[PDB]
């Protein structure tokens, strides 16, 4: 199926002394593969997956130079935005940037993206066509004008449709043993009595990859949303993911209820029942 490469960058200003805290992370699909943290000792881009260790010293020197350049743009941005919004030097502020590309089952370019936020609110984003910009307010509009005069969109489009796609394909090949492998959810169901009248059924999905999954309940063959609780999908810590969904039912009626699991690692969706 489809794949993605995405980079995420956060800078947080430190009023009173020194430069902002800067943290960069890179992902292929749901797998982290690189990081840079300005508070760490190395001041280098670091590997976070075994398959990226295949890359030579020139790659690591080049990514390091680029990630530091990213960090310096963010430092400057924090000063400019404080000016744009007439804010003081006292408070801590945040910039966030995300960019990357998607490819379909044929590993050809599908979509590209590049978005930016200031203090957790939309600031400016490249549109889907990769030709123009969405500016949220009048500050972002000034930036839009700057970037239009300098043809920034043109530079990004070239990266997102070219280099991004090229290197994602490269990563997918080098990391094929994990990156191109699906792990099906390991499912089971638990039971709790709340009182003499009421029971909780909880349907578990564990050890799955990628993160995308659907868990639903049915009663006598029809979808049930009322009296259900579905937790956010959460990392196990070993590269795989976890999720559950629970339903509250009248004691003795457990048999009416079935849990249904959809995941790319399952050719057929699966059904579970109590007892």
């Amino acid at each position: 199926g489809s794949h993605s490469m995405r980079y995420f960058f956060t800078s947080v200003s430190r009023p009173g002394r020194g430069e902002p805290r800067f943290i960069a992370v890179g992902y292929v699909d749901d797998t982290q593969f690189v990081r840079f943290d300005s508070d760490a000792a190395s001041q280098r881009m670091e590997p976070r997956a075994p398959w990226i260790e295949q890359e030579g010293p020139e790659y690591w020197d080049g990514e390091t130079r680029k990630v530091k350049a990213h960090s310096q743009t963010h430092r400057v941005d924090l000063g400019t935005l404080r000016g744009y919004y007439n804010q003081s030097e006292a408070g801590s502020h945040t910039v966030q940037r995300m960019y990357g590309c998607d490819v379909g089952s044929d590993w050809r370019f599908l979509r590209g993206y590049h978005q930016y936020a200031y203090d957790g609110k939309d600031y400016i984003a490249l549109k889907e066509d990769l030709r123009s910009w969405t500016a949220a307010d009048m500050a972002a509009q000034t930036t839009k004008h700057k970037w239009e005069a300098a043809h920034v969109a043109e530079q990004l489009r070239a990266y997102l449709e070219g280099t991004c796609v090229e290197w994602l394909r490269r990563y997918l090949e080098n990391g094929k043993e994990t990156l191109q492998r699906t792990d099906a959810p390991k499912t089971h169901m638990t039971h709790h009595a709340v009182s003499d009248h009421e029971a909780t059924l909880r349907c578990w999905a564990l050890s799955f990859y990628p993160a995308e999954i659907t868990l639903t309940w049915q009663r006598d063959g029809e979808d049930q949303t009322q009296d259900t609780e579905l937790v956010e999908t959460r990392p196990a810590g070993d590269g795989t993911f976890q999720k559950w969904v629970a339903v509250v039912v009248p004691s003795g009626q457990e048999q009416r209820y079935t849990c249904h699991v959809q995941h790319e690692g399952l050719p057929k969706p699966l059904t579970l029942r109590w007892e």
């Binding site: 990630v67 930016y116 400016i124």
Partner: peptide, 9 residues
């Protein structure tokens, strides 16, 4: 592989 240039706001 990171983008080679990042424009400031």
């Amino acid at each position: 592989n990171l983008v080679p240039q990042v424009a400031t706001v």
